[PDB]
């Protein structure tokens, strides 16, 4: 009954549980059961229009944000018209019969439909329509060129194709709902006019000189005291039993204050000091009670890279191992349980507490991105004038950090003024929610801008992002989790990678009792998708136990001897069931049918990856691919590429609004657990290696300069020669431009691909945010910017004079535009990055790395600045 749905969750988790059943913490069963009520509406929202409103839950709209074209995209119309082609199933025989039509581009579903029945009777609303191939539907009144599949087909060239389908046919499919409950379900702090002191007892779990706990009162990242050290005592005895002072009054403590503390060795040779172990706790609890009495604090291991003594970043809370450095503290004890005053008590305290050149000055602080600092001089200047800052809103985060936040006195007045804020842009919202901003009035404003302006398009574009920032939350329960939670529960795209996001860090311990907590009331109210969600979690441990034996223990051997483990273990019962009839973890709508051994491969690429390839079992598939073609990767971190693929889309869209048409390929990538993943195969693509050793001779020279544009030459005869030279050129500028501003490494040619039709694309972003420079090579082949001279030759036709013809020119001219519209769009950009930098990527471990962006960018120059610094970098590479 319910003990079969909690084995199912506990797979879907990978933990049992039961396992949260046996946690004592009141917050942690307070989050089970009040995370409940988050469920119950979003199973209440699927049945309002039931059964319309349960299919377009299962089977979401794929829309653009907007219906407006930009006037290139409406250009590739004829006469504002598109040719669709609409299929139906007949029966006998099961024939496949097509109707063209040309419709307007705008024609809602339902008008394209009448259509169609026209043009089939010519030899009322009870059917939908489908795209041939997956399992994606038109169920909404948009025009029909939002939806991503249209919008695709328009810009690409290509004619759509979908299938009329009988409305009862899908319906009848849809299974009941299933969501059950589970069993499972003072003084003010103003008043205590001390200042804070806290009781550092004794260490358990600690086996160098000497050793100390080093102890900060801070407020995201800030301290908003000086740091408190205990004395140092031998190793052998670390009991303390010492009264910390801080120089800090408990009325002046902000909501979100926490307590920061690490045990830290010193070693005289210069004293050498190292932290061992640290640990932050919030100050109040999440029934907003400020701490009393005794606790014992479990610490965590240190973060490669640290170089601070403290971790005021870090996660909050007790390690789940026990059996790691345990710190023992006292907390007073007022007589009573003291608690953070109400918002009217907090009104009446604010209440009690009261030129053109400078409306110019903060319009210019406002502009300034995340990383930008941020003067004492200026912070003055921000918050005298912070009636003013209410006409200019996207200037709250520079207000919010000139706030003395360990003065209740302006914390009181920031409350006044952050709820009566006018509503701001989701992009400028979500840097509300990183780890510079923890107070939850902040974060509440931040959630509800979301709630408002935020798209389901939008919202799945960010995902990666506010899945990232719910580690900063200080509580279980809070306004982020319960929007997320919902979004999920409501729009099953959505849901399904939310659920990803979640899963792939669930071997992170920092985060596991969260995200784990967080996954069980999603399991609980998904339906039957959690059904689908076990066959995924299970072909996935199937192929990282593959590959895991495959890198550990067959790691030398050959690729034939490779092949034949390979082959041996994939043709076993429990493998083949496990791998096929399954939906893709990259895109729900696409099943996974039968696999084709025979084309499965271990590919020579670093970490050896696995090349699969399965049926498409879709009626239809031959309209849309017959074989779905998957790279699965043990070794990478594949988050970095996530990262990078949703810039490049967003690069994209910033450069197609504006009517440059820079043709880039964001193909799906997919984390699925630590250093595990998916990437999406780009049909019909080669690398410029091989195409260089298609055209290269043996024993001769291979790399050479003019091959590539001898095959794509033979690739488009005639009329389409032009086209090809015309989208390498504008998709080669686009590439140009973004692995320049990201500083996107391993540029070699087996990392950069072209299609037959002249699309080049890159892969492979495990190296960003630095110039990783060649060990040997001519100087203009060591540069940050990337154009090889066989780029050169295809852009300019073929001539030798490449850097002189006027097809150059133009390319350059793209790359001017394309450069200088990204740099007016940096805030986004560094922001997106800020908000991963506690992810544990490789190459994203500090502020240093996201600089590299503010150096290409040239954010501390002028436009005109920039620009000829961007001249003379792609002047270096040829
Ligand atoms: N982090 C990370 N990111 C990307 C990759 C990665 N991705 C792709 N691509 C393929 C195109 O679609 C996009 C993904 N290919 C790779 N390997 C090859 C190219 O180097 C080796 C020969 N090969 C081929 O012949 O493919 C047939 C044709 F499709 F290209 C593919 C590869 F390692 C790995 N790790």
Redesign the pocket.
């Known amino acids: 009954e319910e003990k079969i749905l909690n084995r199912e969750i506990g797979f879907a988790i990978g933990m049992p549980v039961c396992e949260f059943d046996m946690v004592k913490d009141p917050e942690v069963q307070d989050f089970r059961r009040n995370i409940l009520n988050v469920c119950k509406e979003a199973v209440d929202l699927r049945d309002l229009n039931s059964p319309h409103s349960r299919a377009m839950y299962v089977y979401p709209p794929n829309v653009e944000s907007s219906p407006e074209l930009p006037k290139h995209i409406y250009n590739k119309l004829d006469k504002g018209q598109i040719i669709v082609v609409i299929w139906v199933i007949v029966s006998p025989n099961n024939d496949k019969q097509k109707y063209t039509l040309k419709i307007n581009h705008d024609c809602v579903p339902e008008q394209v439909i009448a259509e169609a029945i026209r043009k089939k009777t010519r030899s009322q609303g009870k059917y939908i329509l489908k795209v041939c191939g997956c399992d994606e539907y038109f169920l909404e009144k948009y025009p029909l060129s939002q939806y991503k599949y249209i919008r695709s087909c328009i810009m690409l060239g290509r004619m759509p194709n979908l299938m009329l389908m009988a409305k009862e046919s899908l319906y009848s499919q849809l299974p009941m709902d299933c969501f059950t409950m589970p069993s499972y379900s003072t003084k003010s702090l103003w008043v205590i006019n001390s200042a804070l002191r806290i009781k550092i007892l004794c260490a358990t779990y600690v086996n160098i000189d000497k050793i100390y706990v080093r102890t900060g009162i801070y407020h995201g990242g800030e301290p908003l005291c000086d740091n408190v050290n205990t004395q140092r005592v031998p190793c052998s005895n670390p009991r303390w039993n010492e009264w910390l002072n801080y120089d800090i009054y408990i009325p002046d403590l902000p909501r979100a204050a926490r307590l920061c503390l690490s045990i830290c060795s010193v070693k005289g040779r210069k004293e050498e000091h190292c932290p061992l172990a640290w640990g932050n706790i919030n100050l109040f609890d999440y029934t907003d009670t400020l701490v009393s009495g005794k606790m014992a604090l479990n610490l965590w291991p240190v973060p490669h890279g640290l170089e601070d003594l403290l971790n005021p970043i870090g996660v909050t809370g007790s390690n789940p191992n026990k059996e790691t450095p345990c710190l023992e503290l006292e907390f007073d004890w007022f007589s009573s349980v003291v608690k953070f005053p109400d918002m009217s008590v907090i009104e009446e305290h604010a209440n009690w507490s009261v030129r053109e050149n400078d409306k110019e000055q903060l319009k210019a602080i406002s502009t300034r991105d995340p990383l930008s600092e941020i003067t004492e001089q200026e912070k003055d200047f921000l918050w005298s004038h912070r009636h003013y800052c209410v006409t200019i809103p996207e200037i709250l985060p520079k207000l919010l950090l000139s706030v003395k936040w360990n003065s209740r006195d302006e914390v009181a007045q920031m409350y006044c003024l952050v709820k009566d804020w006018p509503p701001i842009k989701p992009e400028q919202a979500m840097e509300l929610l990183d780890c510079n901003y923890p107070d939850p009035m902040v974060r509440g404003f931040a959630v509800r801008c979301l709630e408002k302006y935020l798209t389901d398009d939008k919202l799945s574009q960010y995902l990666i992002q506010l899945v990232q920032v719910l580690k900063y939350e200080q509580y279980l329960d809070n306004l982020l989790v319960r929007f997320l939670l919902k979004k999920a529960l409501t729009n099953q795209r959505i849901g399904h990678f939310f659920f990803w996001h979640l899963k792939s860090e669930m071997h992170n311990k920092t985060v596991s009792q969260r995200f784990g907590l967080l996954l069980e009331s999603y399991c609980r109210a998904c339906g039957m998708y959690l059904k689908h969600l076990n066959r995924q979690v299970e072909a996935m441990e199937k192929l990282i136990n593959l590959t895991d034996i495959l890198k550990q223990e067959k790691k030398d051997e050959t690729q034939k001897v490779q092949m034949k483990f390979l082959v041996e273990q994939m043709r076993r019962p429990d493998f083949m069931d496990a791998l096929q009839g399954f939906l893709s973890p990259l895109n729900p709508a696409h099943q996974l049918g039968n696999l084709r051994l025979e084309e499965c491969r271990i590919?020579?690429?670093?970490?050896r990856?696995l090349?699969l390839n399965w049926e498409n079992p879709d009626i239809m598939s031959e309209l849309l691919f017959q074989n779905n073609?998957i790279?699965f990767?043990n070794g990478?971190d594949?988050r970095?590429?996530m990262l990078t693929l949703q810039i490049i889309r967003i690069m994209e869209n910033i450069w197609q609004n504006q009517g440059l048409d820079l043709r880039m390929?964001p193909?799906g990538?997919l984390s699925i657990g630590d250093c595990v993943?998916l990437?999406?195969?780009?049909?019909?693509?080669?690398?410029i290696?091989?195409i260089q050793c298609k055209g290269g001779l043996k024993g001769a020279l291979q790399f050479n300069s003019h091959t590539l544009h001898q095959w794509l030459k033979d690739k488009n005869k005639g009329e389409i020669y032009d086209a090809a030279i015309d989208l390498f050129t504008r998709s080669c500028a686009g590439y140009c431009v973004a692995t320049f501003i990201l500083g996107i490494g391993d540029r070699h040619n087996?990392?950069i691909?072209v299609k037959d039709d002249g699309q080049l694309?890159h892969?492979?972003?495990?190296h960003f945010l630095d110039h990783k420079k060649k060990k040997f090579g001519y100087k203009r082949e060591r540069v940050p910017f990337v154009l090889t001279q066989d780029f050169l030759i295809v852009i300019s036709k073929g001539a030798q004079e490449c850097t002189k013809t006027r097809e150059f020119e133009r390319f350059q001219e793209m790359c001017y535009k394309a450069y200088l519209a990204i740099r007016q769009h940096a805030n986004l950009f560094i922001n997106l990055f800020s908000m991963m930098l506690g992810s544990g990527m490789p190459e994203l471990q500090s502020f240093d790395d996201i600089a590299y962006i503010r150096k290409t960018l040239a954010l501390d120059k002028t436009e005109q600045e920039a620009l000829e610094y961007f001249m003379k970098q792609m002047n270096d590479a040829h």
């Open positions: 590919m020579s690429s670093a970490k990856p090349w073609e790279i990767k990478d594949l970095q590429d390929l193909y990538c993943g990437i999406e195969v780009v049909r019909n693509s080669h690398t290696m091989q087996s990392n691909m694309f892969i492979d972003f495990g």
